[PDB]
Scaffold this active site. Sequence first.
Site, PDB file in Angstrom:
ATOM      1  N   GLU A   4      39.125  39.159  -9.358  1.00  0.00           N
ATOM      2  CA  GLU A   4      38.003  39.771 -10.057  1.00  0.00           C
ATOM      3  C   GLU A   4      38.438  40.507 -11.324  1.00  0.00           C
ATOM      4  OE1 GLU A   4      35.906  42.025  -7.062  1.00  0.00           O
ATOM      5  OE2 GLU A   4      34.790  40.245  -6.383  1.00  0.00           O
ATOM      6  N   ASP A  29      29.392  44.582  -8.182  1.00  0.00           N
ATOM      7  CA  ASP A  29      30.844  44.683  -8.307  1.00  0.00           C
ATOM      8  C   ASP A  29      31.265  45.451  -9.544  1.00  0.00           C
ATOM      9  OD1 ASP A  29      31.520  43.090  -5.977  1.00  0.00           O
ATOM     10  OD2 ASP A  29      31.171  41.301  -7.227  1.00  0.00           O
ATOM     11  N   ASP A  43      28.187  40.469 -10.512  1.00  0.00           N
ATOM     12  CA  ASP A  43      28.773  40.151  -9.206  1.00  0.00           C
ATOM     13  C   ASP A  43      29.646  38.933  -9.373  1.00  0.00           C
ATOM     14  OD1 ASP A  43      27.402  42.125  -7.868  1.00  0.00           O
ATOM     15  OD2 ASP A  43      25.764  40.807  -7.220  1.00  0.00           O
ATOM     16  N   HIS A  75      22.870  36.865  -4.778  1.00  0.00           N
ATOM     17  CA  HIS A  75      23.477  37.748  -5.777  1.00  0.00           C
ATOM     18  C   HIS A  75      22.948  37.486  -7.184  1.00  0.00           C
ATOM     19  CE1 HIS A  75      26.190  39.937  -3.172  1.00  0.00           C
ATOM     20  NE2 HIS A  75      26.601  38.796  -2.639  1.00  0.00           N
TER      21      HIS A  75
END
EC number: 3.1.-.-
Lengths: 116, 104
Positions: A4, A29, A43, A75
Amino acid sequence: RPGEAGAAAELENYLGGTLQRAPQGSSVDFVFSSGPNNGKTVDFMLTPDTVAQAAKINQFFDKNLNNFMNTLSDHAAAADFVPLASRFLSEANKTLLVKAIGNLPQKLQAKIILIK
Amino acid sequence: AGSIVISKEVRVPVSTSQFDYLVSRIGDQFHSSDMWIKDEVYLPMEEGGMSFISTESLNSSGLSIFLATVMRARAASQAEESFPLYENVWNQLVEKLRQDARLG
């Protein structure tokens, strides 16, 4: 983190500003802390942290496709962007993913970003 | 960034941080005899590298056990300072498990 983290870095070149990990307990996120997308939420999915993990995703992508896509739509509905670091996917699986994405409602497709 | 899949149509979407937080706590609370349940549920992550786990294949008994295991993890987490930041998602997860047709 590294998957990520890398994805966020790359996304910053295309969406501008800075991308910060959302605060603990957030349903998203990352959040843009500056730039033209300041305030917008992100996300990630398909951002494997290791070579081993990318291999696992590839080997069983078909088995997990339905749950993956349902999670993806959830999401995409909730966040402003859902980027996928899909470069590691086999060509076989990229075909599966692109086809599946094309069957989601258009409002969700516009939210999904394939990091090239 | 991930989810807990309860059944095909019922999911608890979570962030990556929530996903890691939940799977780790739930994972610690299984009884020795129930380890096969964990393995079945955690398969998409452990076998498949996915950011989800799934209880969709469990029968009523297996799912009952999974819910009991989730509540144990939730209890064991109340002590922790982070707990209020995660309470809403524990509640979401327990609720959707309770509402599962197999537990009717």
